[PDB]
Amino acid sequence: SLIDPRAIIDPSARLAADVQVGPWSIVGAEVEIGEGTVIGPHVVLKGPTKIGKHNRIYQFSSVGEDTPDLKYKGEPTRLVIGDHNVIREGVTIHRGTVQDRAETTIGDHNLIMAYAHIGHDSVIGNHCILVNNTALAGHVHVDDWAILSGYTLVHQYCRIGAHSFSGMGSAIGKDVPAYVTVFGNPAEARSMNFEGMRRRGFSSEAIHALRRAYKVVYRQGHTVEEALAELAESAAQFPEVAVFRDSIQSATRGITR
Amino acid sequence: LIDPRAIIDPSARLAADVQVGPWSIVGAEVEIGEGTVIGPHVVLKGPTKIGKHNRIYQFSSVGEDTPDLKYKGEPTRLVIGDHNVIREGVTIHRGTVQDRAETTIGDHNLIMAYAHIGHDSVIGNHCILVNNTALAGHVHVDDWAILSGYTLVHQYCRIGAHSFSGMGSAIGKDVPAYVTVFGNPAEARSMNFEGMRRRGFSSEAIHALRRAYKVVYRQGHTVEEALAELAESAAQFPEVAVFRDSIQSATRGITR
Amino acid sequence: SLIDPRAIIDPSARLAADVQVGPWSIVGAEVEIGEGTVIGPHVVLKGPTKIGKHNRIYQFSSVGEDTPDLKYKGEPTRLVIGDHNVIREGVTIHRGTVQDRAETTIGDHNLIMAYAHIGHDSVIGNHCILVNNTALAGHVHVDDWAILSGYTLVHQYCRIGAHSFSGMGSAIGKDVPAYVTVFGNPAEARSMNFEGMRRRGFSSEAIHALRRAYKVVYRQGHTVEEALAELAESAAQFPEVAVFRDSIQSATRGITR
Numbered sequence: 228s229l230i231d232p233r234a235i236i237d238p239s240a241r242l243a244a245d246v247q248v249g250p251w252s253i254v255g256a257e258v259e260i261g262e263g264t265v266i267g268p269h270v271v272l273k274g275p276t277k278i279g280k281h282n283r284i285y286q287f288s289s290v291g292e293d294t295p296d297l298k299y300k301g302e303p304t305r306l307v308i309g310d311h312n313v314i315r316e317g318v319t320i321h322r323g324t325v326q327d328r329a330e331t332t333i334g335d336h337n338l339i340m341a342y343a344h345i346g347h348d349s350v351i352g353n354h355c356i357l358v359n360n361t362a363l364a365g366h367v368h369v370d371d372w373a374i375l376s377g378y379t380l381v382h383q384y385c386r387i388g389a390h391s392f393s394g395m396g397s398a399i400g401k402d403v404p405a406y407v408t409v410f411g412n413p414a415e416a417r418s419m420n421f422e423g424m425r426r427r428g429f430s431s432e433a434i435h436a437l438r439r440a441y442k443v444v445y446r447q448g449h450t451v452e453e454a455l456a457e458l459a460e461s462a463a464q465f466p467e468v469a470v471f472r473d474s475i476q477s478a479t480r481g482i483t484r
Numbered sequence: 485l486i487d488p489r490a491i492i493d494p495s496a497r498l499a500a501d502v503q504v505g506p507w508s509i510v511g512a513e514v515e516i517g518e519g520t521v522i523g524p525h526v527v528l529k530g531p532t533k534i535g536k537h538n539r540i541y542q543f544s545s546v547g548e549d550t551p552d553l554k555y556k557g558e559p560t561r562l563v564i565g566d567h568n569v570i571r572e573g574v575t576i577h578r579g580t581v582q583d584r585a586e587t588t589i590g591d592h593n594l595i596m597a598y599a600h601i602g603h604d605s606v607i608g609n610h611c612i613l614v615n616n617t618a619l620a621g622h623v624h625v626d627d628w629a630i631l632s633g634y635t636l637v638h639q640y641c642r643i644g645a646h647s648f649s650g651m652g653s654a655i656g657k658d659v660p661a662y663v664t665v666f667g668n669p670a671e672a673r674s675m676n677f678e679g680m681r682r683r684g685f686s687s688e689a690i691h692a693l694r695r696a697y698k699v700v701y702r703q704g705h706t707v708e709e710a711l712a713e714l715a716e717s718a719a720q721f722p723e724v725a726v727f728r729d730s731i732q733s734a735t736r737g738i739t740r
Numbered sequence: 741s742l743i744d745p746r747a748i749i750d751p752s753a754r755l756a757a758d759v760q761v762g763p764w765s766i767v768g769a770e771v772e773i774g775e776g777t778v779i780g781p782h783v784v785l786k787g788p789t790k791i792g793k794h795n796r797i798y799q800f801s802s803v804g805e806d807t808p809d810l811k812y813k814g815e816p817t818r819l820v821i822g823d824h825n826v827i828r829e830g831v832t833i834h835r836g837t838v839q840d841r842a843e844t845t846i847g848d849h850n851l852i853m854a855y856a857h858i859g860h861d862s863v864i865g866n867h868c869i870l871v872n873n874t875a876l877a878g879h880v881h882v883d884d885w886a887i888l889s890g891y892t893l894v895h896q897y898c899r900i901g902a903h904s905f906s907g908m909g910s911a912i913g914k915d916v917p918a919y920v921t922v923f924g925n926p927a928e929a930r931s932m933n934f935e936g937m938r939r940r941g942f943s944s945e946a947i948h949a950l951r952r953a954y955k956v957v958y959r960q961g962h963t964v965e966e967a968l969a970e971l972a973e974s975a976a977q978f979p980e981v982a983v984f985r986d987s988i989q990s991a992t993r994g995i996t997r
């Protein structure tokens with residue numbers, strides 16, 4: 228451990244073994260930091276916030292702030308961050324709202340690049356990448372391995388499916404199904420993230436069942452109900468297709484087309 | 485109240501109950517008013533006036549020089565009213581001598597993280613600038629206007645009262661009062677009926693304003709023709725006069 | 741003195757005797773700063789980094805950090821900045837990767853406005869303007885006098901030609917030839933920077949030949965090869981047309997059309 232004496236550590240904060248806190252950082256009341264986490268210089272941490280192990284948080288980041296969206300803040304709302312996350316320069320992460328989840332949740336092994344915004348009540352899974360200035364407005368669910376390219380904007384309540392991909396400057400207003408590639412403002416479905424399936428070792432059979440799964444949903448004039456029925460068999464054979472099918476079935480307010 | 489690790493210039497001026505966080509700079513000729521909380525890690529530069537019950541969050545640079553090459557160090561101003569919330573990393577520049585030598589913000593404005601307010605810009609009251617909104621300079625934002633995340637505005641554009649931009653809009657012409665605009669480049673879509681409900685507009689003044697939108701946008705009229713038919717509706721409803729006056733004062737083109 | 745006592749200066753740092761450094765700034769290990777350079781408060785400089793003379797770096801800037809690019813594995817890579825550059829509030833500049841030439845390079849007289857990003861292995865020439873929140877992903881070459889308007893996004897390996905211009909919110913995925921004006925997401929070729937050419941004092945004859953050069957590349961159904969061959973003659977007569985022609989010849993991502 229090195230706790231720099233120019234940092235401010237609230238008496239109610241809890242620091243585990245091997246935690247580093249750089250100069251002029253604030254570890255506010257009710258912030259818990261897990262084993263081996265490195266807080267850079269000029270970082271503002273605010274609670275109630277739970278941060279796990281072996282995280283890295285860069286300078287000028289505001290982690291666990293209140294949403295500005297309310298004037299009168301509800302407390303106590305939480306921020307939970309898991310393990311092995313990188314949070315780059317100037318990132319903003321807001322805690323939840325009493326109305327909704329009362330918690331913003333980030334899992335493990337995520338890369339959140341400079342000036343990205345994680346809005347109130349959002350949930351990030353594991354192994355996600357949010358590129359520079361990605362902004363999640365609030366109540367955004369990002370499932371595992373999803374990649375949002377630089378300056379991707381996401382409206383409230385949108386679901387970003389597992390292994391999905393957004394192009395630079397995408398503006399997402401509807402759910403993105405698992406594996407789907409989206410581009411533009413407003414965002415449009417283009418293809419699937421075949422590159423990602425390969426890099427995570429999907430069988431060719433799985434990749435071909437997912438290609439056919441795309442066409443079923445987007446290209447053959449079927450209701451969502453008819454697509455779910457058509458996808459049932461492929462979904463039962465391939466867990467990878469089931470992830471796709473589940474992402475479409477969970478979309479009650481429709482999907483990015 | 486003033487944290488001892490903050491830097492207060494001799495020539496600054498702070499009201500009784502002003503709070504200033506650690507590692508913040510209150511530079512030369514900065515006035516701060518009653519009940520204003522300056523966060524930690526804030527750079528204020530002057531000549532700048534800040535009113536009362538304002539909150540400025542960490543990493544904000546309020547009152548710097550414009551990098552606009554037309555600026556050359558003249559002692560231009562920035563003025564900020566009361567009950568404003570300025571969030572993480574906001575940049576606000578002072579005026580230029582070429583145009584009035586003042587940047588102006590009124591009252592009850594919510595300016596979210598990394599928003600930029602360029603030289604000589606004039607913001608009214610009860611405005612929302614969502615994350616990373618950017619006003620290049622000489623942008624006039626009238627009362628109750630809402631600019632959604634990453635809204636970009638070119639110099640000299642007028643954003644009308646009760647107007648709304650969608651996420652990632654790029655505005656290059658005046659937005660009339662109450663008009664909703666979307667995309668890059670921004671195009672007119674509808675009227676902020678929502679925002680009229682929010683101000684307790686009579687259902688008559690709301691029907692008057694729906695008619696007004698159809699006169700301007702949906703009936704192949706010119707602006708001169710559209711301004712002409714509105715004249716009586718604007719005499720009848722002050723709410724319609726607001727809309728009519730925003731179009732009248734828009735001799736660079738309105739957003740279509 | 742000119743080094744604020746609240747600044748951190750690494751023992752291995754090399755500062756010219758007149759260098760100014762504001763409070764709570766960090767001048768890291770293996771950072772060199774040349775004559776006349778003013779470092780504002782709250783600035784983080786990481787090395788190995790060379791900064792030249794009469795530069796100005798504003799608050800909340802992170803100059804010389806490691807790229808988050810997963811391909812980078814902590815190797816000793818560098819950042820070189822020249823003279824008379826203005827770096828505004830919250831600018832991020834990353835050092836290089838060994839996969840290229842292990843250097844990020846900025847020339848002279850550049851204006852880099854607030855929250856602009858310069859990614860690993862990028863090369864900026866002289867007299868360039870990067871307006872607020874302009875982002876260069878990596879391996880981006882911006883040649884002399886190019887202007888990138890606010891929130892211009894550039895993909896890796898894209899080349900931005902001399903005296904080129906991008907409109908507000910441009911998303912560039914292909915090379916911008918010298919003198920060309922681009923707008924939109926995705927970016928679209930919309931004429932040449934005649935305003936900028938006229939201002940900088942380009943001759944009438946050079947402009948007229950560039951107008952014709954534009955027609956050959958964009959407006960005659962020619963493929964890049966046909967166009968290069970058809971340009972050969974004017975490229976041999978007018979240096980500006982040679983700069984234009986070379987920028988098409990050197991394009992590795994194709995050209996913005």
Ligand SMILES: O=C(/N=C\c1ccccc1)N[C@]1(C(=O)Nc2nnn[nH]2)CN(C(=O)c2cccc(C(F)(F)F)c2)c2ccccc21
Nearest residue numbers: 296344362363364382383384612614615632633634650651
């Ligand atoms: O709320 C919003 N807009 C204006 C506002 C009003 C009062 C207070 C603050 C902002 N929310 C927005 C939203 O997605 N609302 C919604 N959709 N479904 N259910 N709720 C997201 N939004 C935005 O512009 C927005 C809001 C917060 C954060 C961000 C960002 F950029 F950081 F991600 C962006 C927008 C733009 C147009 C319409 C609706 C909304």
Ligand SMILES: O=C(/N=C\c1ccccc1)N[C@]1(C(=O)Nc2nnn[nH]2)CN(C(=O)c2cccc(C(F)(F)F)c2)c2ccccc21
Nearest residue numbers: 551552600602618619620621638639871872889890907908
């Ligand atoms: O305004 C501009 N240049 C001077 C400048 C102003 C402020 C700071 C630095 C330079 N350029 C712009 C402009 O609106 N010029 C103009 N119109 N009418 N009269 N002048 C805006 N502009 C921009 O890209 C721009 C310039 C400054 C700030 C911002 C932002 F994002 F922070 F808001 C954006 C742009 C993009 C394309 C064409 C013209 C212009």
Ligand SMILES: O=C(/N=C\c1ccccc1)N[C@]1(C(=O)Nc2nnn[nH]2)CN(C(=O)c2cccc(C(F)(F)F)c2)c2ccccc21
Nearest residue numbers: 358359376377394395808809857875876877878895896897
């Ligand atoms: O480049 C990318 N990923 C690696 C990386 C680089 C720098 C930092 C972190 C990761 N992805 C991108 C790329 O250009 N890849 C590529 N092209 N040629 N060879 N590779 C760019 N990219 C981006 O979204 C991107 C990546 C890093 C930084 C930035 C920004 F915004 F800061 F400028 C943007 C994107 C979006 C869609 C497709 C491909 C790519």
